[PDB]
Write a protein that binds this ligand. Sequence first.
Ligand SMILES: Nc1nc(Cl)nc2c1ncn2[C@H]1CC[C@@H](CO)O1
Length: 225
Amino acid sequence: KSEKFAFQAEVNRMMKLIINSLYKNKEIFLRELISNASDALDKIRLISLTDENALAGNEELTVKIKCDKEKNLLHVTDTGVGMTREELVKNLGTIAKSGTSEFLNKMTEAQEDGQSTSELIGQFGVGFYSAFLVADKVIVTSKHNNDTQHIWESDSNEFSVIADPRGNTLGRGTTITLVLKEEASDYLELDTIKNLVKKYSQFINFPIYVWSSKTKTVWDWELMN
Ligand SMILES: Nc1nc(Cl)nc2c1ncn2[C@H]1CC[C@@H](CO)O1
C-alpha cells in the first residue's frame, strides 16, 4: 500500500530557504505548527456555518500538545478540518496551493535584500517545513470528513502516504508528530514546551492544551489558552 513520492523541486528549495531563515531561531517551529492548527480550526469552523453535520466526527475545536520524552516524540494535534489523502500529497509535497508560489518569490527577494522573512513564513502559512530544524522525521496523521485517516511521513529526502491501519482515531483533525534530533531533546521537556506554547498561543482564538503532570502523579490537559 505505502506509496512513495519525491518532493517537487520548488518545495525542496522552499524547505532550504525556510530552514536557513529560522536557523538561529529554531524555537519558531512550534509557533508555525500552532498557527497551522489555528488555520485548520478556522476552516472547519467556517465550514460548520454551512454544513450542519460538520463537527460530527469531533465536536471539539482544540489544539492539544503532548511530549513523549520516553519515545523522543513531540505531538501537535488539532481538531481542525484535516486533510484527505490527496491534500496530504499535494499540500505537503508541492507548491500547488494558490499563493505558495508568491511566497517562494517574495521570500527569495527578501532574503536577498536583507529584509525580514520571519513574517513572510507566517504570512503565507508555509511554516510546516521549519519542523525539520528540530526533527529528523516528521509524521502527519490526518482525518478529513471526506476521506479516511491517512499518515504522511518524511525525513525531507522523500515522503510516503499510507492509509492509517489504526482506523479513524482522530475523529477529524491532524496530528503533527516530530521525531526530535538529539540536539533538540530539550523540546521533550514539559516546562520548555509549556513555556513556548504560551509565548506563541496568546493570540490564537482556540483553546490550547498541553498534557502536563503535577507530582502521586496527576496527568491532564493544562490550558495555556
Ligand atoms: N495542521 C494542519 N491542518 C491542515 Cl487541514 N492542513 C495543514 C496542517 N498543517 C499543514 N497543513 C497544510 C496547509 C499548509 C501546507 C504546507 O505547509 O500543509
